[PDB]
Design an enzyme around this catalytic site. Structure first.
Site, PDB file in Angstrom:
ATOM      1  N   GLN A   1     -23.243  -6.649  37.942  1.00 37.52           N
ATOM      2  CA  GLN A   1     -21.854  -6.602  38.407  1.00 37.52           C
ATOM      3  C   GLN A   1     -21.202  -7.980  38.577  1.00 37.52           C
ATOM      4  OE1 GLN A   1     -21.149  -4.953  42.342  1.00 37.52           O
ATOM      5  NE2 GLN A   1     -19.315  -3.938  41.565  1.00 37.52           N
TER       6      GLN A   1
ATOM      7  N   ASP B   1     -20.318  -9.081  34.958  1.00 37.58           N
ATOM      8  CA  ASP B   1     -19.227  -8.279  34.424  1.00 37.58           C
ATOM      9  C   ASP B   1     -17.904  -8.751  35.010  1.00 37.58           C
ATOM     10  OD1 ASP B   1     -17.138  -6.390  35.051  1.00 37.58           O
ATOM     11  OD2 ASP B   1     -18.246  -4.890  33.916  1.00 37.58           O
TER      12      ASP B   1
ATOM     13  N   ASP C   1     -17.246 -11.710  36.176  1.00 31.65           N
ATOM     14  CA  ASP C   1     -16.941 -13.054  35.734  1.00 31.65           C
ATOM     15  C   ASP C   1     -16.232 -12.913  34.395  1.00 31.65           C
ATOM     16  OD1 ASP C   1     -17.448 -15.664  34.176  1.00 31.65           O
ATOM     17  OD2 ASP C   1     -18.287 -16.207  36.120  1.00 31.65           O
TER      18      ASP C   1
ATOM     19  N   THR D   1     -11.030 -15.125  32.794  1.00 33.44           N
ATOM     20  CA  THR D   1     -11.417 -15.850  31.590  1.00 33.44           C
ATOM     21  C   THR D   1     -12.643 -15.282  30.901  1.00 33.44           C
ATOM     22  OG1 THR D   1     -12.822 -17.452  32.764  1.00 33.44           O
ATOM     23  CG2 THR D   1     -10.486 -17.937  32.629  1.00 33.44           C
TER      24      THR D   1
ATOM     25  N   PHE E   1     -14.903 -16.551  29.435  1.00 38.08           N
ATOM     26  CA  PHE E   1     -16.089 -17.422  29.497  1.00 38.08           C
ATOM     27  C   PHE E   1     -16.990 -17.315  30.733  1.00 38.08           C
ATOM     28  CE2 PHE E   1     -14.707 -19.670  25.779  1.00 38.08           C
ATOM     29  CZ  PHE E   1     -13.314 -19.676  25.853  1.00 38.08           C
TER      30      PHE E   1
ATOM     31  N   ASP F   1     -18.144 -18.698  33.191  1.00 35.41           N
ATOM     32  CA  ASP F   1     -17.759 -19.987  33.749  1.00 35.41           C
ATOM     33  C   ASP F   1     -17.581 -19.991  35.249  1.00 35.41           C
ATOM     34  OD1 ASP F   1     -15.655 -18.317  34.031  1.00 35.41           O
ATOM     35  OD2 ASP F   1     -14.146 -19.599  33.062  1.00 35.41           O
TER      36      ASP F   1
ATOM     37  N   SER G   1     -15.610 -18.002  36.880  1.00 32.09           N
ATOM     38  CA  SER G   1     -14.245 -17.669  37.255  1.00 32.09           C
ATOM     39  C   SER G   1     -14.211 -16.849  38.536  1.00 32.09           C
ATOM     40  CB  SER G   1     -13.559 -16.889  36.143  1.00 32.09           C
ATOM     41  OG  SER G   1     -14.298 -15.716  35.853  1.00 32.09           O
TER      42      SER G   1
ATOM     43  N   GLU H   1     -15.857  -5.148  47.433  1.00 31.01           N
ATOM     44  CA  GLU H   1     -15.901  -3.727  47.116  1.00 31.01           C
ATOM     45  C   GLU H   1     -17.151  -3.082  47.681  1.00 31.01           C
ATOM     46  OE1 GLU H   1     -18.276  -2.900  44.449  1.00 31.01           O
ATOM     47  OE2 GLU H   1     -17.955  -0.744  44.374  1.00 31.01           O
TER      48      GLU H   1
ATOM     49  N   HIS I   1     -23.309   1.234  36.203  1.00 29.28           N
ATOM     50  CA  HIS I   1     -23.001   2.268  37.194  1.00 29.28           C
ATOM     51  C   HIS I   1     -24.151   3.262  37.380  1.00 29.28           C
ATOM     52  CE1 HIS I   1     -18.374   1.635  36.550  1.00 29.28           C
ATOM     53  NE2 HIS I   1     -18.942   0.643  37.216  1.00 29.28           N
TER      54      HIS I   1
HETATM   55  C1  HEM Z   1     -18.878   0.477  43.983  1.00 28.12           C
HETATM   56  C2  HEM Z   1     -19.193  -0.109  42.612  1.00 28.12           C
HETATM   57  C3  HEM Z   1     -20.357  -0.676  42.220  1.00 28.12           C
HETATM   58  C4  HEM Z   1     -21.707  -0.886  43.015  1.00 28.12           C
HETATM   59  C5  HEM Z   1     -21.958  -0.310  44.242  1.00 28.12           C
HETATM   60  C6  HEM Z   1     -20.188  -1.064  40.852  1.00 28.12           C
HETATM   61  C7  HEM Z   1     -21.158  -1.637  40.133  1.00 28.12           C
HETATM   62  C8  HEM Z   1     -21.181  -2.101  38.850  1.00 28.12           C
HETATM   63  C9  HEM Z   1     -22.360  -2.669  38.178  1.00 28.12           C
HETATM   64  C10 HEM Z   1     -23.790  -2.840  38.781  1.00 28.12           C
HETATM   65  C11 HEM Z   1     -21.971  -3.002  36.921  1.00 28.12           C
HETATM   66  C12 HEM Z   1     -22.804  -3.642  35.741  1.00 28.12           C
HETATM   67  C13 HEM Z   1     -24.132  -3.517  35.527  1.00 28.12           C
HETATM   68  C14 HEM Z   1     -20.553  -2.635  36.842  1.00 28.12           C
HETATM   69  C15 HEM Z   1     -19.742  -2.806  35.727  1.00 28.12           C
HETATM   70  C16 HEM Z   1     -18.372  -2.468  35.732  1.00 28.12           C
HETATM   71  N1  HEM Z   1     -17.721  -1.770  36.737  1.00 28.12           N
HETATM   72 FE1  HEM Z   1     -18.366  -1.098  38.411  1.00 28.12          FE
HETATM   73  N2  HEM Z   1     -18.955  -0.791  40.409  1.00 28.12           N
HETATM   74  C17 HEM Z   1     -18.307  -0.209  41.457  1.00 28.12           C
HETATM   75  C18 HEM Z   1     -16.988   0.217  41.356  1.00 28.12           C
HETATM   76  C19 HEM Z   1     -16.119   0.057  40.258  1.00 28.12           C
HETATM   77  C20 HEM Z   1     -14.713   0.477  40.114  1.00 28.12           C
HETATM   78  C21 HEM Z   1     -13.851   1.189  41.142  1.00 28.12           C
HETATM   79  C22 HEM Z   1     -14.320   0.097  38.900  1.00 28.12           C
HETATM   80  C23 HEM Z   1     -12.922   0.274  38.221  1.00 28.12           C
HETATM   81  C24 HEM Z   1     -12.901   1.313  37.100  1.00 28.12           C
HETATM   82  C25 HEM Z   1     -11.525   1.560  36.485  1.00 28.12           C
HETATM   83  O1  HEM Z   1     -11.401   1.759  35.221  1.00 28.12           O
HETATM   84  O2  HEM Z   1     -10.558   1.579  37.307  1.00 28.12           O
HETATM   85  C26 HEM Z   1     -15.458  -0.546  38.297  1.00 28.12           C
HETATM   86  C27 HEM Z   1     -15.447  -1.072  37.100  1.00 28.12           C
HETATM   87  C28 HEM Z   1     -16.438  -1.679  36.387  1.00 28.12           C
HETATM   88  C29 HEM Z   1     -16.165  -2.323  35.092  1.00 28.12           C
HETATM   89  C30 HEM Z   1     -14.873  -2.548  34.210  1.00 28.12           C
HETATM   90  C31 HEM Z   1     -14.231  -4.010  34.499  1.00 28.12           C
HETATM   91  C32 HEM Z   1     -12.965  -4.331  33.770  1.00 28.12           C
HETATM   92  O3  HEM Z   1     -13.009  -5.001  32.698  1.00 28.12           O
HETATM   93  O4  HEM Z   1     -11.924  -3.909  34.276  1.00 28.12           O
HETATM   94  C33 HEM Z   1     -17.458  -2.828  34.676  1.00 28.12           C
HETATM   95  C34 HEM Z   1     -17.579  -3.563  33.363  1.00 28.12           C
HETATM   96  N3  HEM Z   1     -16.539  -0.566  39.109  1.00 28.12           N
HETATM   97  N4  HEM Z   1     -20.084  -2.096  38.025  1.00 28.12           N
HETATM   98  O1  LIG Z   2      -9.801  -3.693  44.709  1.00 28.81           O
HETATM   99  C1  LIG Z   2     -10.971  -4.063  44.900  1.00 28.81           C
HETATM  100  O2  LIG Z   2     -11.257  -5.183  45.353  1.00 28.81           O
HETATM  101  C2  LIG Z   2     -12.089  -3.106  44.583  1.00 28.81           C
HETATM  102  C3  LIG Z   2     -11.857  -2.448  43.231  1.00 28.81           C
HETATM  103  C4  LIG Z   2     -13.050  -2.733  42.352  1.00 28.81           C
HETATM  104  C5  LIG Z   2     -14.152  -3.373  42.887  1.00 28.81           C
HETATM  105  C6  LIG Z   2     -15.259  -3.654  42.109  1.00 28.81           C
HETATM  106  C7  LIG Z   2     -15.266  -3.291  40.781  1.00 28.81           C
HETATM  107  C8  LIG Z   2     -14.164  -2.657  40.241  1.00 28.81           C
HETATM  108  C9  LIG Z   2     -13.053  -2.375  41.020  1.00 28.81           C
HETATM  109 CA   LIG Z   3     -14.904 -15.940  33.350  1.00 27.73          CA
END
Ligand code: HEM
Ligand SMILES: O=C(O)CCc1ccccc1
Ligand SMILES: [Ca+2]
Ligand SMILES: *[C@@H]1O[C@H](CO)[C@@H](O[C@@H]2O[C@H](CO)[C@@H](O)[C@H](O)[C@H]2NC(C)=O)[C@H](O)[C@H]1NC(C)=O
Ligand SMILES: *[C@@H]1O[C@H](CO)[C@@H](O)[C@H](O)[C@H]1NC(C)=O
Ligand SMILES: *[C@@H]1O[C@H](CO)[C@@H](O)[C@H](O)[C@H]1NC(C)=O
Ligand SMILES: *[C@@H]1O[C@H](CO)[C@@H](O)[C@H](O)[C@H]1NC(C)=O
Length: 595
Positions: free
Chosen positions: A105, A108, A110, A184, A186, A188, A190, A258, A351
Site C-alpha cells: 500500500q 501503490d 507513492d 508523481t 516516480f 520518489d 512523493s 486511512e 486488497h
Molecule cells: C482500508 C484499505 C486498505 C488496508 C487496510 C487498503 C490496502 C491496500 C493494499 C495493501 C494495497 C496494495 C497491495 C492497495 C492498493 C490500492 N488500493 Fe487500497 N486499501 C484500503 C482502502 C482503499 C480505498 C477506499 C481505495 C479507493 C478505491 C476507489 O476506486 O475509490 C483504495 C484504493 C487502492 C488503489 C487505487 C489507487 C489509485 O490509483 O487511485 C490501489 C492501487 N484502497 N490498497
Molecule cells: O481519504 C482518505 O484519506 C482515505 C481514502 C483512501 C485511503 C487509502 C487508500 C485509498 C483511499
Molecule cells: Ca511518486
C-alpha cells in the site's frame, strides 16, 4: 491522426537544466517531454479506453446498453457472490509477514492516485447522491442487488462518485475521458514530501535552517516524532471518536490515516528523514537548510527503490520477476514512466492480502494489553489508538510477527473491508471495497479481462470450460460465467485476481505481466534512479546497498529485536536477532570538503 494533445489545467514547464534534485511535481525528469511522469496529468492508456458511448459514460450506466451482447452485473452482486467469505480461519499467508501487505500500500500510494471530482463543498450534491441514490453526472451510486442484506439496514445504495478527469470538469465531446494521476509516477517518496509544492512547503519545518520535516508539537512517542495533525474540518479521525478528538495526520500523500498501520509506516518514514538530516548536518555542518532537506529526501527515495525492487517485487512476482524486470541497464529516455490507468487497478491485488485484525505486541512480542488484537474496521481513520494508546512501537511489532491474508479463490476480500469500510464524509462503517473497485473499473472505461489477457500474450477463454482451465477452478469459473455471461466482460480487477498464484510469487500470470511491465518502466525511464550512473557516487551506492527495513525499524523506534528478512513470516524469538548484528546506513560517503 491524433492531436498534438490537450492541456488546459496545467501550468508551463520551466526546467532548470543544472539541478541535481527531482522536482516535487515530477516535472523535468524527462528532457524531451518534461511533463512525462508528473502529478496532475492524465494516467497513461496502454489500450484505448472502453466506454459505454466510447467517450465518457461507464458501462452499466444505461439499463438498455449492454457490453458485448450482455448486461454487466452490479458491482455489489459480484462482490457478494464471489468476493465474500465468513470463515477467517486458516487464511493467513504462512510465508509473508503483515509488513508485506503494508509495503504494498505504501508503494501503490507513492505511485498513483485518482481522486474523485470536487462538487461537494458548499453544495448539497454529495448528500443528494447518498440520500436518494440518483445517478447523475458524477454521482454513480452503487446499487444493492435484490437479496442483499444491506438493503434492509442501509438503503438502496452505496454512494459513489466518478473520478476526476483532465481538461475538466463538465464533460467534453472529442477524445475519450482520461482520469488524473494526482501524484508523481516516480518511486520518489512523493507520499512523504508531497506532489504539490504548496503542500510540500507546508509539510516542511522552515523555522530552523536544519532541513527537517515538520513534526507534531502536541504529542510525542518516547521522544520520537509524530506526523503533524491536519487541522482541517470536518475530519474523519475526529468523527470516528468524537470524545478523543484526534485529527488525521498531515503527510505527503492525502490518504495517510486511512488505516492505523499505513499511518504507522508513514510515521517511520518521516523519522528516517529527520534522522538523516541530523546525520548530514553533523558531517557537513556548513550545509544550508535546503541542501539538508534535498540530500535527505534523495536518500529516502533511494531507500524505497531498493526495498521495493530488491526485497518486495521478487516476492510478489517471483518466477516472473526476471521475465519483466531484468537487472538494471541504465536510464532510457524513450521509456514512458507514466503510471498506466490499469496499473492503478492491477495493484489493488493487495486488497486480498488484508487480514481481519491487527495486534499490538509487547517487548517479548506478546499481546500488549487486554485488547491487543483489534478488528480492522475500528482502525480506519483511527489516529487516537496511536497517540492515546502507546504509539507506533507496538504496532510495528505486529507488522513483523503477524501474517498477511493469503489470496484465496474462495476467500478473497475480508468483510472488514467488504461490508464495513468507512469512507470520509459518510457516517457509517458499512461500505464495500470490492464493489467500489469494480465500479471504478467501469468508471475508468477499463477494457475487459480478455483484452488484457490478449495484451499480455496469454490465451483468451471464451467458454465455461475455457475459463475453468485458466482459473484452475470449476465453481469460480461457474460463478463468474453466471454473472458475466462471457469472460470478455469480466472486470479486470476481479479477473486478474481470480487467476491462481504463479509459483514463488503472490499474483497470477496476468497481473505479473501488467505489474511487471509498469515497474520496469518505472525504473528504466527514471533519470534519477538511485543506480543510474552519476546520481549517487560510486561509494554512496555501496553504502545504500546495505539498507533494510529492519534497519529502518531499529533507527526509528525502540524495538531492538528484528528479523533479517522483514517480508517473510518470522516468529519470535527464533527468527529475531538483535539490532546490533544488522548493517547500518553508514553516511560517511556524503562528506563535502569545501576547499
Ligand atoms: C482500508 C484499505 C486498505 C488496508 C487496510 C487498503 C490496502 C491496500 C493494499 C495493501 C494495497 C496494495 C497491495 C492497495 C492498493 C490500492 N488500493 Fe487500497 N486499501 C484500503 C482502502 C482503499 C480505498 C477506499 C481505495 C479507493 C478505491 C476507489 O476506486 O475509490 C483504495 C484504493 C487502492 C488503489 C487505487 C489507487 C489509485 O490509483 O487511485 C490501489 C492501487 N484502497 N490498497
Ligand atoms: O481519504 C482518505 O484519506 C482515505 C481514502 C483512501 C485511503 C487509502 C487508500 C485509498 C483511499
Ligand atoms: Ca511518486
Ligand atoms: C475513544 O477514545 C477514547 C480516548 O482514548 C477511548 O477512551 C479510552 O478507552 C479506555 C476505556 O475503556 C481507557 O483505557 C482510556 O483511558 C479511555 N479514555 C477515555 C477518556 O475514556 C475510547 O475507548 C474511545 N471510544 C471509542 C468508541 O472508540
Ligand atoms: C522546527 O525545528 C526546531 C529546531 O529543531 C524545533 O525546535 C521545532 O519544534 C520545529 N518545529 C516544527 C513545527 O517541527
Ligand atoms: C529504450 O526504449 C525504447 C522504447 O521502449 C526501446 O525500443 C529501446 O530498446 C530501449 N533502449 C534500450 C537500451 O533497451
Ligand atoms: C519464504 O519466502 C522467502 C522469500 O521471502 C523464500 O526465499 C523462502 O524459500 C520461503 N519459504 C517457503 C517455505 O517457501
Amino acid at each position: 491522426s491524433w492531436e498534438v494533445g490537450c492541456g488546459a489545467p496545467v501550468p508551463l514547464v520551466k526546467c532548470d537544466e543544472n539541478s541535481p534534485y527531482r522536482t516535487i511535481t515530477g516535472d523535468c525528469n524527462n528532457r524531451r517531454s518534461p511533463a512525462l511522469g508528473a502529478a496532475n496529468r492524465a494516467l497513461a492508456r496502454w489500450l484505448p479506453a472502453e466506454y459505454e458511448d466510447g467517450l465518457a459514460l461507464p458501462f452499466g450506466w444505461t439499463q438498455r446498453k449492454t457490453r458485448n451482447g450482455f448486461r454487466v452485473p452490479l458491482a455489489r452482486e459480484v462482490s457478494n457472490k464471489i468476493v465474500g467469505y465468513l470463515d477467517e480461519e486458516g487464511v493467513l499467508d504462512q510465508n509473508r509477514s503483515l509488513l508485506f501487505m503494508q509495503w504494498g500500500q505504501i508503494v501503490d500510494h507513492d505511485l498513483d492516485f485518482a481522486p474523485e471530482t470536487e462538487l461537494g463543498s458548499n453544495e448539497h450534491s454529495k448528500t443528494q447522491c447518498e440520500e436518494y441514490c440518483i445517478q447523475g453526472d458524477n454521482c454513480f451510486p452503487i446499487m444493492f442487488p435484490k437479496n442483499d442484506p444491506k438493503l434492509k439496514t442501509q438503503g438502496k445504495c452505496m454512494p459513489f462518485f466518478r473520478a476526476g478527469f483532465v481538461c475538466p470538469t463538465p464533460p467534453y465531446q472529442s477524445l475519450a475521458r482520461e482520469q488524473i494521476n494526482a501524484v508523481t509516477s516516480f518511486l520518489d517518496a512523493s507520499l512523504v514530501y508531497g506532489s504539490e509544492p504548496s503542500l510540500a512547503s507546508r509539510l516542511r519545518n522552515l523555522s530552523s535552517p536544519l532541513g527537517l520535516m515538520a513534526v507534531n508539537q502536541e504529542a510525542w512517542d518516547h521522544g520520537l516524532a509524530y506526523l503533524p495533525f491536519n487541522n482541517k474540518k470536518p475530519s474523519p479521525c475526529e468523527f470516528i471518536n468524537t470524545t478523543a478528538r484526534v485529527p488525521c495526520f498531515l503527510a505527503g500523500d492525502f490518504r495517510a490515516s486511512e488505516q492505523i498501520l499505513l499511518a504507522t509506516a508513514h510515521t517511520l518514514l518521516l523519522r528516517e528523514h529527520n534522522r538523516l538530516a541530523r546525520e548530514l548536518k553533523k558531517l557537513n555542518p556548513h550545509w544550508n537548510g535546503e541542501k539538508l532537506y534535498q540530500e535527505a529526501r534523495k536518500i529516502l527515495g533511494a531507500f524505497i527503490q531498493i526495498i521495493t525492487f530488491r526485497d518486495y517485487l521478487p516476492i510478489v512476482l517471483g518466477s516472473e520477476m526476471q521475465k519483466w524486470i531484468p537487472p538494471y541497464q541504465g536510464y532510457n529516455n524513450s521509456v514512458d514512466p507514466r503510471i498506466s490507468n490499469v496499473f492503478t487497478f492491477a495493484f489493488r491485488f493487495g486488497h486480498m492480502e488484508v487480514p481481519s485484525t491487527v495486534s499490538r505486541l509487547d517487548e517479548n512480542y506478546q499481546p500488549w494489553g487486554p485488547e491487543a488484537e483489534l478488528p480492522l474496521h475500528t482502525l480506519f481513520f483511527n489516529t487516537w489508538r496511536i497517540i492515546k494508546d502507546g504509539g507506533i512501537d507496538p504496532l510495528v511489532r505486529g507488522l513483523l510477527a503477524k501474517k498477511s491474508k493469503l489470496m484465496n479463490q474462495d476467500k478473497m476480500v475480508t468483510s472488514e473491508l467488504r461490508n464495513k469500510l468507512f469512507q470520509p464524509t459518510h457516517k457509517i462503517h458499512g461500505f464495500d471495497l470490492a464493489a467500489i473497485n469494480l465500479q471504478r473499473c467501469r468508471d475508468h472505461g477499463m477494457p475487459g479481462y480478455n483484452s488484457w489477457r490478449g495484451f499480455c500474450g496469454l490465451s483468451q477463454p471464451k467458454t465455461l470450460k475455457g475459463l475453468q482451465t485458466v482459473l484452475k477452478n470449476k465453481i469460480l469459473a461457474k460463478k463468474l460465467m453466471d454473472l458475466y455471461k462471457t469472460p470478455d466482460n469480466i472486470d479486470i480487477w476481479i479477473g486478474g485476481n481470480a487467476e491462481p498464484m504463479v509459483e514463488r510469487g503472490r499474483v497470477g500470470p496476468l497481473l505479473a505481466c501488467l505489474l511487471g511491465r509498469q515497474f520496469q518502466q518505472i525504473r528504466d525511464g527514471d533519470r534519477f534512479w538511485w543506480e543510474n550512473p552519476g546520481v549517487f557516487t560510486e561509494k554512496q551506492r555501496d553504502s545504500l546497498q546495505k539498507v533494510s527495513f529492519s534497519r529502518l525499524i531499529c533507527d526509528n523506534t525502540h524495538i531492538t529485536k528484528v528479523p533479517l528478512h522483514a517480508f517473510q513470516a518470522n516468529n519470535y524469538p527464533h527468527d529475531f536477532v538483535d539490532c546490533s548484528t544488522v548493517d547500518k546506513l553508514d553516511l560517511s560517503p556524503w562528506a563535502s570538503r569545501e576547499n
